[PDB]
Amino acid sequence: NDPSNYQLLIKNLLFSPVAFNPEQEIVYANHRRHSYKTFHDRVRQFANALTKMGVKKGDTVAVMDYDSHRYLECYFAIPMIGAKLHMINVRLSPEQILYTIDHAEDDIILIHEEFLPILDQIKGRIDTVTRYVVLRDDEECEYERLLEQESTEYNFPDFDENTVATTFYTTGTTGFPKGVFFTHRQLVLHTMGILSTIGTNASQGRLHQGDIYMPITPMFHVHAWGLPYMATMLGVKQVYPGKYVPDVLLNLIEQEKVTFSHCVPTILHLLLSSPKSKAMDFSGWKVVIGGAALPKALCKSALERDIDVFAGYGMSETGPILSIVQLTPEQLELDVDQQAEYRSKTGKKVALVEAYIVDEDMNKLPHDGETAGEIVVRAPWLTPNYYKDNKNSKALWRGGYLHTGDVAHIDDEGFIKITDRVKDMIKISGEWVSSLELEDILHQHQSVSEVAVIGMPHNKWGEVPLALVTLKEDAQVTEKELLGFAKDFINKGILAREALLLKVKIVDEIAKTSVGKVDKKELRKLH
Amino acid sequence: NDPSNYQLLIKNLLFSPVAFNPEQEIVYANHRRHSYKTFHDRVRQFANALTKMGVKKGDTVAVMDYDSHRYLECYFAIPMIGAKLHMINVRLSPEQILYTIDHAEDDIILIHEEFLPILDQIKGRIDTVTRYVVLRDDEECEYERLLEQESTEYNFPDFDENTVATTFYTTGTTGFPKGVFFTHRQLVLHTMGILSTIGTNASQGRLHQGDIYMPITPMFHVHAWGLPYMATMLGVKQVYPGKYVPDVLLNLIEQEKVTFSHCVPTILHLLLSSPKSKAMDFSGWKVVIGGAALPKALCKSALERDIDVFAGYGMSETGPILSIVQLTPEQLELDVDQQAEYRSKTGKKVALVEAYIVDEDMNKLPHDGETAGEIVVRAPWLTPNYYKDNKNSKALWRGGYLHTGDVAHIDDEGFIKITDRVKDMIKISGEWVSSLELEDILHQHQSVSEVAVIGMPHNKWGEVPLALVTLKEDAQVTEKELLGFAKDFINKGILAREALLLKVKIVDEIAKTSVGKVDKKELRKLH
Amino acid sequence: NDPSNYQLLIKNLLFSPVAFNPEQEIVYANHRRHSYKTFHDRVRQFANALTKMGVKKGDTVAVMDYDSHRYLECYFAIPMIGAKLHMINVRLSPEQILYTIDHAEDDIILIHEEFLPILDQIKGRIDTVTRYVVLRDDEECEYERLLEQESTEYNFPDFDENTVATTFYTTGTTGFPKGVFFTHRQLVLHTMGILSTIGTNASQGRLHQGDIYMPITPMFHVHAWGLPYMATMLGVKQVYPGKYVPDVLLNLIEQEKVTFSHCVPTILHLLLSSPKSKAMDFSGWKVVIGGAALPKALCKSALERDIDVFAGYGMSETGPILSIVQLTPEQLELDVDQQAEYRSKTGKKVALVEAYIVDEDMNKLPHDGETAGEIVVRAPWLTPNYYKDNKNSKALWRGGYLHTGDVAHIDDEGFIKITDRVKDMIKISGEWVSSLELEDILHQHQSVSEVAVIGMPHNKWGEVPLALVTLKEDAQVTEKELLGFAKDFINKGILAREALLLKVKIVDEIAKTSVGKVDKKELRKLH
Ligand SMILES: CCCCCCCCCC(=O)NS(=O)(=O)OC[C@H]1O[C@@H](n2cnc3c(N)ncnc32)[C@H](O)[C@@H]1O
Ligand SMILES: CCCCCCCCCC(=O)NS(=O)(=O)OC[C@H]1O[C@@H](n2cnc3c(N)ncnc32)[C@H](O)[C@@H]1O
Ligand SMILES: CCCCCCCCCC(=O)NS(=O)(=O)OC[C@H]1O[C@@H](n2cnc3c(N)ncnc32)[C@H](O)[C@@H]1O
Ligand SMILES: [Mg+2]
Ligand SMILES: [Mg+2]
Ligand SMILES: [Mg+2]
């Protein structure tokens, strides 16, 4: 450790922030409420407790928790002692969750009591975990008891900024969940990079030191988009809602005067459709919408409620944020219909992001508002590869750029607009489902000859899976029978819960290509 | 060059900014005006011209220029081809300037025609420079002609982010000017670090994308505090005033609607005292004051003009910015007298800066509002050492922290307040003078027995040098004779021009210590 | 490549064998029959075909095939060009097979047509495979057509002997299948090491140059125990039976005059129980029994048929062979009952194997015939770790020895006798099932409170799983309902086919320990 050789460490985000008010509050719904000074104490207590549990630098601590203060402490204390924080996506099927736990080789799992039923399905096949800390919202929490037995004093190590700080698994690709990891330097740069982008907005879409922060993106989803790191960096009041309940979320916005939040379009649809939201005041509330395309109708409805609603774009692989919608003063003077179109765009690339539209030959395409191609990016917060993966990692970084798998056109003013997907994947309410995997399960039916699963757009869910099934030579099976057939795979924890919204459309034939492959591009036009 | 191994390069500040409007203007006073798209073209043309002149990676290009568009292009094009940009402090004496040119081994000097008289004094003793490009504000500029002969196309190299990008020399220490250098990574982090700090301010002291930028800090002074990099990153309109004339500066603020600027307290004193400023409107003008302590009276006078005036602190060695004044909403509601006290503080440390108060034994002192000690800092943009210097570099980084040489107390809320200096140096209107060097010159007088030079505070200049001279056994020399004696050293280019404000006070004795050393701490109390 | 620096390469097993008769035959059941000279030609043709398909050194070629001549060519040609041969255990569930294909990142899969139904279950989730070569026992084989288009000339590379030659996955541990790998040097040493052991036997249990070899161990099971490499090294006639049919196997033994074979005890039980075997002559037939404990009754029945039947011991992790039964001339003169006891022992350690009995503290135990402990081994053909695995690899090599997970006592004469298992795993007919995984599936039943699965010994299957289920507070579910419940998991390809032999025994309570854990050691005594 050379003192002049500064390392970009997550501990510098905490102890060298943009602003620190020791009396500013971290609020956990209606369960807990303490100050930033207490939060710094609990990070050091957690670091002491982790050291006592034998967590060393390079160890993996897994977290299965809701959006809480404990998760925020996990964001700092675990990477800050040099350990790897593994955010377990609790919305995956138990079999997928078991894979990521064994693949990541977690030493300790901090699991909420409500996720214990998931554990009992896969506990026997977990071999790396030596300790389970059960998390509770009451005084009987094992995490809270571990912290109480520790001092609020800890000297956090200096290590290389390229130490891996966080890992998590995305199901956005084919096959098994892929592990993406991020270093301390990448997370620090992502915090400063996006703060420099959305902090410096003139009027609209600002994250500033006077904001009150409440995530409605799960903290296992690409670091809650990285906003808890930015919210801590700004020293703002942070409200953690726990398990997402629309009435609980709406009460927290009014009671804690939340001004900045973020979520997938499904959450905003649920928040705006709730009967209690009708009498609510949203004048000071800003929400950035990511994970899925923001519908113009949903953006318009939020605008009528005086919500500063704008869109953002990112990936698990890309330290999430790649582009955010920024409106010029001229664009802010437009009518609600014209404003809703700009606010629902994919967005302009954020600072230090090189986003290009290319074709299959990696040739860069002109940035007119019509020519479409895959988005390839270079940024200081991209995963260099998938964890313990070679061939898929090479495809991710083919041609020297990270491939997003998203087809988009970029206009003259830099506004990206995603048109469709390269990958044969469907995102439902923020969770991934693989069409090929869904086809395989539905093909296991005895009276099924061919299955083609496509993503049908949905106003509430974003996309829903549509299975176009060709019957056998003399087979007659109703559509709802296949839905019940696939439900049994969900009940066993093999298929994702989001396939419960699958629609089966029996068709006489499935359109193909001259080579014999299924033509899904032409298939979506017909249905 | 590994594509996934992102390098923090100054070319990423330009081509991956927070915002880019190709039709946004770069304005050079009343001489030139072009768009950001032209500015990017002229950077590539300059890169082509530098390549033709044989500038390679690792070469030093020196610039002797006013605050212009050419200097802004020098900020990018020279580091972006991997060359070292040397900002020559044209306010130093010609002998000091000659030292820094030979010490830095400049290959090419871009010198304005008005600085040619400085060159003719030291041209014979310059051995490393092979080409002089003369800069002119008219069409006869050699820099403009070099650019016209080049294409607007250039592929900027990828190199290590630890490549040195900028060098310049500070006279704030004893002895010869010391060379501080900064890498691409340090400059990029300084841009994002301070943008995350002042961009995210809620209301007061904001640098945002809607601002109009005009520096009144010279661009050879620690990168104009780094603001031109931040202004380019935000893609804002930039107004470069050229040579500082109070009427010209005031006209540019009104005509170009400047909203963000920065300067030393002397400049603000001159701007506010100008008769034309009385009828001017300063409602939208924000200026951050650094380099010297901001007097409460000057801050109050600016506040009566509705100027968002706040203070900042930094050094040549520290990538300048270490702390900036940020006001909470409660502090913004105070009266003008109470507000002027907070706005004139040294400030709260910026993001990623670890500022401590220590004693001579490097023991960290409590942060009460009374206990004073030297500020020692750790930050991602500090010079690791002085150029081609070992012993002074070790003292700069003694105890693992960079020593500022400034004595301060930090209060409970984190507000730093500088009390006095460790180093025996005096800063006059933003330029350094060494008391020991001034004593040596005045000691060369035949009728001088002892000389002690101390810095007397000044309302306009900040500090002025005061020489307390003890006469010889039977000598009688008037005070004004010594002032003329020292003026001859200035006319020869050996002593700094700022010593013209020296005051000689003949005293019967000079207070000393038990060890025999001069007691300057007790000496300032008496006079 | 230093010519004097000899590398132990699999190509030296082929082109520098103990004996080479160019007119000696490789027989594939009743489908194909060619000479050793043709076999060497087809290895070079396969090497040419693999080079044309773009297989480079370090690539993985996966094989899903029966015991054939093609598999024998795969044993040589794939490692001999420096590629990794992945032997896919086709008896695993499709989900397990999919895991090993994705974990190993196979580039090309050589799959028999009869295993294509397994592929269609998991084809959509396979991402690394670019080519499937379908294998057929007729002239329409894609492998045969690929070979016909190539020359019989190939210069095989010299590389480091530590190049990994073979990979395969064992399910003998908890969690996911673990990848064990072996280098060229390890495989060469395993061939010479065991040839020096069983070749030098005086009379009984000899593998010599006059033998006729027929494997009845699948070639995906630890290299068919390594015998095809040894059989090729000796240049003996090799008979490959394809898919195991008891009448087909018995016909090949009589028709091809097979003298040396090997199998699990279940196969020998099936061969001896077949009605056609009654009239067969087994005077010259030797078979070594591994994978499971050889019952004394089965050994005695084989001895009455004049079969030279002896036992051997090994693992997937241990290059299989660790110990083989060798009988002294005095032991060969004993009666059939006393001989059957010695022939059914675990065996004496083979050359270059250091086998020790230790306790949980890695303390070596005395080699009396009663004291039992875990077998830990050091040998020149052990896997150094599991593929892409750290924590499980450390447990495998805890204390500097490879842990077998087998409890045994070693007598004074060196005869090992395995008593029970450390790992909570059950082996059924040569395939592994995890008790904890079986408990988890049976625990998913709504009317199940506690499940404890233990391995009950079986005369035919070796071990069968026994589930002792404690009913809920007021639940009444029949035992056969749970068997049908678990069968559905098998039909979906999640649970192993070998769980079809599970027995459910409803019990009022499950014996536990003072710590609360299930006491399976005491549980097996009760049931
Ligand atoms: C200031 C925050 C602003 C940033 C928010 C977005 C971050 C979301 C992090 C996140 O979806 N990871 S993922 O691996 O679960 O999904 C990644 C995929 O989702 C899609 N997609 C994400 N955003 C989208 C958007 N605005 N419009 C349309 N499509 C969007 C897209 O196909 C991505 O490739
Ligand atoms: C957003 C910009 C806000 C940052 C402006 C300050 C940067 C000035 C960069 C710069 O003075 N370098 S130097 O080497 O020529 O001088 C360095 C010395 O000057 C003194 N000193 C600088 N600031 C001061 C301040 N606010 N109050 C009091 N004393 C101040 C101090 O003794 C430093 O050690
Ligand atoms: C000349 C050949 C002579 C060598 C034949 C044995 C090689 C078998 C290669 C093979 O079982 N791998 S495994 O990973 O599928 O199983 C490994 C486990 O099986 C058990 N076990 C293997 N043999 C056994 C035996 N003779 N008596 C009793 N128990 C035996 C034992 O618990 C092992 O740990
Ligand atoms: Mg993703
Ligand atoms: Mg300085
Ligand atoms: Mg094994």
Numbering used by the authors:
A (entry chain B), B (entry chain A), C (entry chain D): 6 to 532
What does the paper say about this structure?
In addition to the two controls we introduced, (i) AasS alone and (ii) its complex with C10-AMP adenylate, we focused on the complex of AasS liganded with C10-AMS inhibitor. Unlike the two controls that are characterized with a dimension of ‘140x150x80 Å’, the inhibitor-bound AasS architecture is relatively compact, because that its dimension is only confined to ‘130x140x65 Å’. Except for a sulfamoyl moiety that replaces a phosphate group, the C10-AMS inhibitor resembles the C10-AMP intermediate. Structural alignment of C10-AMP adenylate-bound conformation with its C10-AMS inhibitor-liganded form, elucidated that conformational transition is due to the 140° rotation of the compact AasS_C domain. As predicted, C10-AMS inhibitor was also found to bind an array of almost-identical active sites in the AasS_N part. However, AasS_C domain adopts a closed conformation rather than an open state to benefit its C10-AMS recognition. In place of K522 exploited in C10-AMP binding, the AasS_C K432 residue produces several interactions with surrounding oxygen atoms. Additionally, The W437 residue here forms a hydrogen bond with the bridging oxygen atom. Unexpectedly, this inhibitor was found to trap AasS enzyme in a ‘closed’ conformation, which likely represents the enzyme at the very beginning of the second step reaction where the adenylate serves as a substrate, before the binding of the ACP thiol substrate. The resultant blockade prevents other substrates from binding/entering AasS enzyme.
The acyl-ACP synthetase (termed AasS) of the zoonotic pathogen Vibrio harveyi recycles exogenous fatty acid (eFA), bypassing the requirement of type II fatty acid synthesis (FAS II), a druggable pathway. Very recently, the AasS (533 aa) of V. harveyi was found to feature a large domain at N-terminus (termed AasS_N) that is connected with a compact C-terminal domain by a flexible linker. As expected, a hexamer ring-like overall structure was invariantly formed in all the three types of AasS particles, regardless of a cofactor/inhibitor. Obviously, the pattern of AasS oligomerization is recognized as a trimer of dimers, which mainly relies on two interfaces constituted by the AasS_N domain.
